[PDB]
């Protein structure tokens, strides 16, 4: 059954990693069906790597301050929470960085093993002073979605281990809106507008492509009951 | 201007319009007279061109003369003398 | 427009007219409720307009003495013994006695268990008094109330104003095409439907000989038979439907007094002015904001709320000095696609669709003479068109309506009919359309809540319970607590209980709340109808207990909890709503204020004679009145050109009107407004009053 | 007199004005509203009604 | 009740009415 | 924007689409265009949608009380036959969706279209011209949703709790994107107190000063915020430069926010922000889950006990009345007071019983609808039922609407409700008549000149000093002091000047004046304008509708009349001095009031003499004048309580109100000049008018008072 | 959980069936259930009668002598017909009965390629004068389409338009049960209940919904 008006997908980039995808026109009622599904799958389907647990020398039970540097430890937790990483191996990879003396400690000081990459070298981490020495250890693992802090099973072996919330998803925030454009002579179609903010590791175009891919697989799973089953058709490209 | 883009009939922001005019009544008459001039030019385009000059800004596909007048006012392409 | 409106139009007490007092003549004291109104005239049923309090409705038990004074019945109690003897008292006879409370703790021996009883004293004062000295009691509850207000369930839980408006909107419901009976109501619905006179009632008992849509033949016991001729699709005085569907079979026995056929708004012989719609009381995304009501597309698709509306169009051909006007197809300068649906007799074929602007009857009048324009002569010279010596003032469908035609009635003098002297043909055509429910139509309950249809959104975008049944109608929650109409929430809960069915576990005795609950009410099948007298009905404890045990219909699913609220799933986003909301079946009714008969607009219509202002109304092309109060607003805005435009050229200045229309059609600039004609009319009028008024240039 | 006669006690003020031969100025708000003239407020005063408009020399030279 | 074709309308009414309407 | 039915739009723009389609060659001539339009050919709709491009259209609702009753929108074609109104402009229109209809008008000329587009555009009319409070308010549903969004519920899901020794706080969040992720799962709730770092919102002024320093912009630097995620969402709707609020969002909180927004930001910005607030409030109203059943309307357990105790207080009184010691009137008054106390106690019990999360409690506490008296009438104690003559029935109801009334209690409640519903029909008609008279008297007051260069002015009280010594703020400041122009310099202790002459006298001016210790300032008003015709712009001060200086040709007289007479329908009388619409009407008719109050004539001590059936007063002068005697002071009037309460022999002022009631304006005029009459009239009308809780700026009444006092009499030929 | 979701079937009744989809991502179950539900209730193709014609009567607001009902209730009775067709071109049914008795939906004669799934539904009742001759027009469609106008098409005067509701799906529902374990091994298990109007199997309706949604999401997947 021919829709008789092909819905299109048009994007206008805003920043280096920011875009709005417009989908129009749609069969009445389908705007929300596509919008909410895309919004959920964008931040819950794309695989990505993130930190899982953290340990730093000088603190074992004092979870407030670490000497050498002046700012507290929660600031460090947030800073290395907001790290974008890409890992090609599923095993927990160990991140090291060691700065001596006064200075500015940034994410570029991280020494990555092969297969683990950091795309924001120039992000502030700490401000060392007074001949301070700071050694930071991170655990990096890949997965999907957003996972809260997971309690460290090896508390006895790693007492300095601290669980942290983890932004696995390469996309940060997606919002959707349904307008009612061009209704009268074209039987009440609607328009979908998606605004996406993803980490600089991947582009919003690729994020949407991967989300569409996984959703198409998931829904063809449902379509694989009757190979032939009449529905709607779209048309030429 | 930190505001987001305007839409519809508010495409020229009203305050930027009031910036160039002493008071809003003067702005209303200022827009209306130029709209009348634009319509007169449109009527007399094919015939002999008179003193009136049409849209100093490029109009859209098809537009009301009043919107053209407002855009011209916002662009400081016209001058007016208070009574 | 429904049986209740007919019932309430009669048995109504007015105060205006010859010998009465006008509304201007009416003071504040008369409009008030007198203590003597009790039992005689209902204190709730009265219109909300200027006539508030001036006109009311008779009570349900009220009687008119053979003397013109009003009179009500009351049981007489003696030494604390209640008698069955019913005696009738007027307003003046009540003062010298002491009437008791309607719902008093009667022990079946006539003795009130407490000495102090609520009684009505001589001067209308209510006070405590020992039992032995009271001498009268109300015959029943709902004696002070009329028949239009006795149909409101849970009346005692509602504010007087909202009950008043609910009783008034009960009068103006429309007859739907199915008229489903209400689940929760009052016993007065049956009697009101029966004695309204529009339901067929078997006068004499006997077996039914035969049943058909047009008629019913009933064989009485004493050999003879009687044929009730059913009335089908008759236009009411307000242009509604009055179909009558028989509800009996070809072999049943009917007793004298039993309802034989149902009227417009009756189901099984009882009043049914609306439909039972599932209700969620959450405020949904602002489409039900400020008393707005949102509906599901199921109502549109299933024809739950749709009304058949019929209009009539009279048109008469009469004698004239020019000759005679003919009802004929010889209509000048008309096409053929619009002539397809007319008979050679000159009128629309029965069962043919028309719409706004279509011709209905072809009536042609001798045009006489006028200035034939020279341009007309050149026009006929180019095509060979005849002069067409007659004027085609045929009858056309007025603006903004359509539908199929139902019937044509034609009378004429050669039919030897009693036509008015002067006319010799008169044809009247009936056009009906199945008006569906759309935006702007007013829907209301019988508890005072009203509102227009904010939107009709599809079945997908409706909050649905765990069973998956979408809700039909959603109303706001911000109106009910402020406006004080909590009675309809109790009606909603009782309706849900009556729909889902219930049973009270009588295993280890009856529960405490059900002790006073009557038998046969401890068990209720699904979709069971209940009743509730207005002032003696289901209490809070009884309703809570009923809500506790609300056995499911098909699956094992107690959708609503003990407190009435239920979980429901959003149809837009899909996630469940954070908190449960109340749901249940509510009785809603469509009012006769549809938007189709309420939308009007005009560009250039006709104008009045003396002053050139356009006329007003819907029958004429109208034009909204721009009164001086709006002139105040426009002057306060500082907008002078807009005001002058609205006054001179848009309304009055004739040359201004025609010049403006020519300029806007020609795409030219609108010219300078002229001088209003009404000012010149005023000047001439003032001159005629011997006042030398001259306007001086300098 | 035109404003007063349209507010209250029309016959009385009309008779009084006829006797006094009162010459109305037709200058107020209600009088101009009645006769169709521009109201003397907002965009009706000569400061705003007589606004002269013309494009600047550079703007017309850029046409 | 007391109506030959009256549908079964269960009632919550406590007391009885000595006379019909 | 505003919706418009397709058929109505077609009928309105008939010549417009006629030309626009005969030009596009759809119809050969005009007659063919008319035939297409009347037949409604499909090609008509496209050109119709074409011609509505930026064509303003006026909407009006009868009755049109104030200026904002006519608003110019831009129409969008909509299916159906119902005009779609924006939900925000309902309050300004006083429009409701019970079935009310609206009239639509089409401006034609370029001047008319310009006037509709610039002057009467809806997005340009937010502040009410009467008092200056915004009239595009987030209303019932929107304010309920906004209130629910920003509540700080303690002990919620995902709350921030500090921890040490074992694990960190695990309540802090990196970015609001992370918080949104958490809220999408079940870990974090919207109304949970958390700590976030923010980059795109301006921190409050004290945090900005403490941390950021002088250069404290929002977009660059991050900052800790101890807030709820809902508050972050709400603050994201405000303009970028607006500081973070972090407050429970009651109606008055949003009032202050939007007033500041309109004061310090462009009009388009505030219009867009109000639209955003409406959208967010509508979205969160449904999620708030406010919904009422019988379980939500709970009753106070103590009520019966109270209804018993006061019952005893009644019984003895009745018994005493049976003894003859208490007369009928005394018994009635005692019962009335006892039952009033019982109602108050039951209301207090209901207040102490209701949890703060109850849907009705948050409905009333959101500022959306109703008052607690309505809930008390719902459950608990309905109250006292009035009589047709206006008295109180000594035997009141005891149950409430939730419990269900009986026949007789419903009867008396109907008595009262019918009286209340009937009085409104006459009240609003009288209000309309008063509005017409007010418009007619002040029609000649229009701004002509920018400034009259006068020095005369009006002194305002402005937070008079307390006896202990401090600057206690006057309650009536936004009415009298705001939106003026200083006529004289405000200098403290003959030192430096605080506010120069001819200043707008806004909020910063006011708190600077209060900090400096100055309390008395002379502002330039319309009572002292030197312009022969109309009033000068500076004297009239700032226009309330726009918030800036008044225009040069604005008709402020009609605006004043409409502002005074618009909320007149909300006026109600109290339980021989009238205090409702009749009172203000008689004040504006300059007639002798019923409760006439004779006033002193010469400064000096008084002579009080308790006469028969009527008291006697004689003011003995402090100079060689005649001892002025007042005769007709009936015993019904009570002696004025001014300063201890007045008694015989006390020193009185030259125009001191001797007797209680209401002094006649003519007498105070001939005793104390025109200025005292202006003060008295303004104060009395304001006291009567705001006792119902209605705010109107004083200059609107001042215009009418000036129009009153324009004329003078003639004594000698 | 790094696995991939599956889909099973649980047919409780001939029309009502349950589909389980596990494992899903946390919070995805509700959204997926809604996405299936909307397209199941809206865009499932089906067949329904679109226009009837009765020889005796000319329009929609009269009665044919002989039957107890009227045409405006005959149409309401007929609107609950359950017919299934596979050819897209319109095709005419036929009902013809004389004499006393109850005319039911099984009395109509279906041409080749159309099946009536409600042979027991009551249409009307007749008597000695009863004579019913009805012609129905059945064609495939999707969703709810209101009655077209006989003047819009080249339709005979006697033709009576009827509102069309092509929707074999009666009602659908979803419910999930998240695990939400502290060991981050959380997943959603969607359970979808589908009940159709005896025209097509619920499995067929679900397959059609999947076929209607796969290409719509492929619109996003083909961007790259
Ligand atoms: Mg209303
Ligand atoms: Zn001045």
Automatic annotation (TrEMBL), chain B:
Any one GO biological process: DNA-templated transcription
Nucleotidyltransferase is among the record's keywords: yes
Keywords: DNA-directed RNA polymerase, Nucleotidyltransferase, Transcription, Transferase
Catalytic reaction(s) noted: RNA(n) + a ribonucleoside 5'-triphosphate = RNA(n+1) + diphosphate
Record EC number: 2.7.7.6
GO terms assigned for molecular function: DNA binding; DNA-directed RNA polymerase activity
A Gene Ontology cellular-component term: DNA-directed RNA polymerase complex
Broadest EC class assigned to this enzyme: transferase
Family: Belongs to the RNA polymerase subunit omega family.
Oligomeric and partner information: The RNAP catalytic core consists of 2 alpha, 1 beta, 1 beta' and 1 omega subunit. When a sigma factor is associated with the core the holoenzyme is formed, which can initiate transcription.
Role, per record: Promotes RNA polymerase assembly. Latches the N- and C-terminal regions of the beta' subunit thereby facilitating its interaction with the beta and alpha subunits.
Protein name: DNA-directed RNA polymerase subunit omega
Organism classification: Bacteria, Bacillati, Actinomycetota, Actinomycetes, Mycobacteriales
Gene name linked to the record: rpoZ
Residues of the full protein shown: 27 to 109 of 110
């Amino acid at each position: 059954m021919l829709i008789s008006q092909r819905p299109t997908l048009s994007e206008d980039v805003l920043t280096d990693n920011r875009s709005q995808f417009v989908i129009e026109p749609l069969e009445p009622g389908f705007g929300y069906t596509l919008g909410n599904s895309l919004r959920r799958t964008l931040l819950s389907s794309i695989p990505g790597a993130a930190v899982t647990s953290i340990r730093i020398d000088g603190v074992l039970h004092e979870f407030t301050t670490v000497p050498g540097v002046k700012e507290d430890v929660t600031e460090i937790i947030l800073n290395l929470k907001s790290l974008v990483v890409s890992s090609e191996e599923d095993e927990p990879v160990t991140m090291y960085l060691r700065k001596q003396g006064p200075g500015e400690v940034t994410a570029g000081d991280i020494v990555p093993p092969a297969g683990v990459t950091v795309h924001n070298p120039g992000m502030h981490i700490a401000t060392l002073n007074d001949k301070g020495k700071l050694e930071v250890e991170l655990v990096v693992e890949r997965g999907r979605g957003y996972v809260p802090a997971v309690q460290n099973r090896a508390s006895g072996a790693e007492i300095g281990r601290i669980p942290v919330d983890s932004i696995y998803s390469p996309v940060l925030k997606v919002t959707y809106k349904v307008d009612a454009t061009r209704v009268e002579q074209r039987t009440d179609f609607d328009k979908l507008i998606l605004d996406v903010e993803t980490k600089n590791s991947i582009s919003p175009r690729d994020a949407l492509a991967s989300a569409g891919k996984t959703l198409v697989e998931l829904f063809g799973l449902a379509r694989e009951l009757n190979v032939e089953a009449e529905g709607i058709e779209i048309g030429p490209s | 201007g930190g505001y987001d883009t305007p839409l519809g009939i508010t495409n020229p922001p009203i305050d930027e319009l009031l910036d160039r005019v002493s008071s809003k009544y003067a702005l209303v008459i200022y827009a209306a007279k130029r709209a009348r001039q634009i319509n007169d030019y449109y009527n007399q385009l094919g015939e002999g061109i008179l003193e009136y000059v049409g849209p100093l800004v490029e109009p859209g596909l098809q537009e009301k003369p009043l919107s053209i007048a407002l855009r011209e006012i916002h662009a400081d392409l016209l001058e007016h003398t208070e009574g | 427009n429904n049986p209740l409106s007919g019932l309430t139009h009669k048995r109504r007490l007015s105060a205006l007219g010859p010998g009465g007092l006008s509304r201007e003549r009416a003071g504040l004291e008369v409009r008030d409720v007198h203590p003597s109104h009790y039992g005689r005239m209902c204190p709730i049923e009265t219109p909300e307009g200027p006539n508030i309090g001036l006109i009311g409705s008779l009570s349900v038990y009220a009687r008119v003495n053979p003397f013109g004074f009003i009179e009500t019945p009351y049981r007489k109690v003696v030494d604390g013994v209640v008698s069955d003897e019913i005696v009738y008292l007027t307003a003046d006879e009540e003062d010298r006695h002491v009437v008791a409370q309607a719902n008093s703790p009667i022990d079946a021996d006539g003795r009130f268990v407490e000495p102090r009883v609520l009684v009505r004293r001589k001067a209308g004062e209510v006070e405590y008094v020992p039992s032995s000295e009271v001498d009268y009691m109300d015959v029943s509850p709902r004696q002070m109330v009329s028949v239009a207000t006795a149909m409101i369930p849970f009346l005692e839980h509602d504010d007087a104003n909202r009950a008043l408006m609910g009783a008034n909107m009960q009068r103006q419901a429309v007859p739907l095409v199915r008229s489903e009976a209400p689940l929760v109501g009052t016993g007065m619905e049956l009697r009101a439907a029966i004695d309204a006179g529009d339901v067929v009632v078997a006068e004499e008992s006997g077996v039914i000989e035969e049943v058909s849509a047009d008629y019913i033949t009933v064989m009485h016991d004493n050999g003879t038979r009687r044929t009730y001729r059913m009335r089908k699709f008759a236009r009411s005085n307000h242009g509604t439907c009055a179909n009558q569907c028989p509800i009996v079979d070809a072999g049943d026995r009917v007793e004298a007094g039993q309802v034989i056929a149902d009227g417009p708004c009756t189901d099984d012989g009882e009043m049914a002015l609306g439909k039972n719609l599932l209700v969620a009381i959450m405020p949904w995304e602002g489409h039900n904001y400020e008393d707005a009501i949102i509906l599901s597309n199921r109502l549109v698709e299933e024809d739950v709320l749709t009304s058949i509306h019929i209009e009539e169009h009279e048109i008469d051909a009469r004698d004239t000095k020019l000759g005679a006007e003919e009802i004929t197809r010889d209509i000048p300068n008309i096409s053929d696609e619009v002539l397809a649906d007319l008979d050679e007799r000159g009128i629309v074929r029965i069962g043919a669709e028309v719409r706004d602007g279509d011709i209905l009857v072809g009536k042609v009048t001798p045009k006489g003479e006028t200035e034939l324009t020279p341009e007309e002569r050149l026009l006929r010279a180019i095509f060979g068109e005849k002069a067409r010596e007659v004027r085609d003032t045929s009858l056309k469908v007025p603006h903004g309506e359509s539908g199929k035609v139902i019937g044509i009635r034609v009378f004429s003098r050669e039919d030897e009919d009693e036509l008015p002297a002067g006319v010799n043909e008169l044809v009247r055509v009936y056009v009906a359309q199945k008006r569906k429910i759309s935006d702007g139509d007013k829907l209301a309950g019988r508890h005072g809540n009203k509102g227009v249809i904010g939107k009709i959104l599809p079945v997908e975008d409706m909050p649905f319970l765990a069973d998956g049944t979408p809700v039909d109608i959603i109303l706001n929650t911000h109106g009910v607590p402020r406006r004080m109409n909590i009675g309809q929430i109790l009606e909603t809960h009782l309706g849900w209980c009556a729909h889902s069915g219930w049973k009270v576990d009588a295993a280890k005795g009856v529960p405490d709340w059900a002790a006073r609950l009557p038998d046969e009410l401890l068990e209720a099948q699904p979709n069971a109808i209940v009743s509730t007298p207005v002032f003696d009905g289901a209490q809070e404890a009884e309703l809570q207990g009923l809500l506790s045990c609300t056995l499911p219909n098909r699956d094992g699913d107690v959708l609503v909890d003990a407190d009435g609220k239920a979980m429901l799933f959003d149809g837009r986003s899909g996630e469940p709503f954070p908190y449960p909301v109340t749901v249940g079946y509510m009785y809603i009714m469509k009012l006769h204020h549809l938007v189709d008969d309420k939308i009007h607009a005009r560009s250039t219509g006709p104008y009045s004679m003396i002053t050139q202002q356009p006329l007003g109304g819907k029958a004429q092309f109208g034009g909204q009145r721009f009164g001086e109060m709006e002139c105040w607003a426009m002057q306060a805005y500082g907008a002078a050109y807009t005001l002058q435009e609205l006054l001179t050229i848009k309304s009055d200045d004739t040359v201004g009107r025609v010049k403006v229309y020519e300029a806007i059609v020609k795409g030219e600039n609108i010219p300078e407004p002229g001088i209003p004609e009404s000012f010149k009319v005023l000047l001439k009028e003032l001159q005629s009053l011997c006042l030398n008024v001259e306007v001086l240039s300098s | 007199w035109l404003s007063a006669a349209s507010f209250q006690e029309t016959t009385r003020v009309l008779t009084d004005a006829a006797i006094n031969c009162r010459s109305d100025k037709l200058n107020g708000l209600k009088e101009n509203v009645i006769i169709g003239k521009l109201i003397p407020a907002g965009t009706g005063i000569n400061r705003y009604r007589n606004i002269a408009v013309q494009p600047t020399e550079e703007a017309r030279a850029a046409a | 009740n007391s109506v030959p074709g009256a549908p079964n309308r269960v009632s919550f009414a406590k007391l009885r009415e000595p006379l019909e309407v | 924007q505003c919706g418009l039915p397709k058929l109505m739009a077609l009928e309105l723009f008939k010549p417009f689409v006629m030309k626009r389609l005969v030009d596009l060659n759809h119809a050969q001539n005009i007659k063919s265009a008319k035939r297409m339009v009347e037949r409604q050919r499909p090609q008509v709709w496209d050109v119709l949608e074409e011609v509505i491009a930026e064509h303003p259209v006026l909407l009006n609702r009868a009755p049109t009380l104030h200026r904002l009753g006519i608003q110019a929108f831009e129409p969008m074609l909509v299916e159906g036959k119902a005009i779609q109104l924006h939900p925000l402009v309902c309050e300004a229109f006083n429009a409701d969706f019970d079935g009310d209809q609206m009239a639509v008008h089409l401006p034609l000329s370029a001047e008319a279209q310009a006037e509709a587009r610039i002057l009467m555009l809806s997005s340009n009319n937010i502040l009410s011209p009467a008092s200056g409070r915004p009239l595009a308010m987030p209303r019932l549903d929107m304010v309920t949703g906004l209130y629910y969004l920003t509540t700080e519920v303690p002990g919620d899901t995902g709350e921030y709790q500090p921890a040490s020794g074992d694990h960190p706080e695990t309540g802090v969040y990196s970015s609001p994107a992370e918080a949104i992720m958490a809220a999408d799962r079940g870990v974090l709730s919207v109304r949970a107190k958390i700590k976030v770092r923010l980059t795109q919102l301006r921190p409050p002024v004290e945090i900005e000063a403490e941390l950021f320093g002088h250069s404290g912009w929002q977009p660059g630097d991050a900052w800790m915020a101890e807030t709820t995620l809902g508050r972050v969402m709400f603050n994201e709707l405000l303009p970028l430069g607006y500081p973070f609020v972090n407050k429970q969002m009651h109606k008055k909180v949003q009032a202050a926010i939007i007033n500041d927004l309109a004061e310090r930001y462009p009009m388009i910005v505030v219009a867009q922000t109000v639209d955003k607030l409406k959208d967010a409030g509508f979205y969160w109203a449904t999620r708030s889950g406010v919904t009422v059943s019988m379980a939500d309307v709970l009753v106070p357990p103590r009520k019966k006990e109270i209804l018993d105790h006061y019952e005893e207080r009644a019984d003895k009184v009745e018994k005493q009345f049976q003894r003859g010691a208490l007369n009928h009137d005394e018994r009635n008054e005692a019962l009335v007071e006892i039952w009033k106390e019982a109602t108050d106690e039951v209301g207090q019990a209901l207040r102490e019983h209701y949890p703060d999360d109850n849907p009705i409690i948050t409905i009333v506490d959101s500022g959306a609808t109703g008052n607690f008296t309505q809930t008390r009438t719902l459950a608990g104690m309905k109250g006292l039922v009035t009589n047709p003559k206006g008295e109180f029935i000594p035997r009141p109801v005891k149950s409430s609407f939730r419990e269900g009334l009986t026949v007789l209690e419903y009867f008396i409640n109907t008595h009262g409700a019918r009286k209340g519903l009937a009085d409104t029909a006459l009240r609003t008609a009288d209000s309309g008549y008063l509005t017409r008279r007010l418009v007619d008297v002040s029609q000649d007051v229009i701004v002509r000149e920018h400034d009259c260069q006068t020095e005369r002015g009006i002194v305002v009280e402005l937070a008079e000093r307390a006896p202990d010594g401090t600057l206690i703020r006057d309650p009536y400041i936004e009415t009298s002091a705001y939106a003026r122009t200083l006529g004289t310099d405000a200098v403290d202790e003959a030192g430096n000047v605080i506010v120069e002459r001819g200043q707008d006298l806004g909020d910063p001016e006011i708190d600077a004046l209060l900090a400096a210790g100055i309390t008395q300032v002379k502002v330039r008003s319309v009572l002292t304008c030197a312009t022969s015709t109309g009033v000068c712009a500076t004297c009239y001060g700032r226009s309330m509708a726009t918030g800036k200086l008044v225009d040069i040709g604005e008709a402020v007289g009609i605006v004043a009349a409409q502002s005074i007479g618009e909320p007149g329908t909300q006026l109600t009388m109290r339980t021989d001095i009238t205090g409702g619409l009749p009172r203000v009407q008689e004040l504006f008719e300059a007639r002798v009031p019923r409760g006439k109050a004779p006033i002193a004539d010469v400064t000096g001590r008084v002579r009080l003499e308790d006469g028969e059936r009527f008291y006697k007063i004689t003011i003995v002068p402090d100079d060689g004048g005649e001892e002025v005697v007042y005769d007709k002071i009936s015993k019904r009037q009570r002696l004025r309580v001014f300063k201890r309460v007045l008694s015989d022999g006390d020193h009185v002022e030259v125009g001191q109100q001797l007797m209680e009631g209401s002094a006649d304006p003519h007498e105070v005029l001939r005793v104390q000049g025109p200025r005292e009459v202006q003060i008295h009239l303004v104060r009395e009308v304001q006291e009567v008018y705001r006792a119902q809780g209605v705010s109107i700026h004083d200059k609107h009444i001042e215009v009418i008072v000036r129009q009153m006092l324009r004329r003078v009499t003639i004594i000698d030929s």
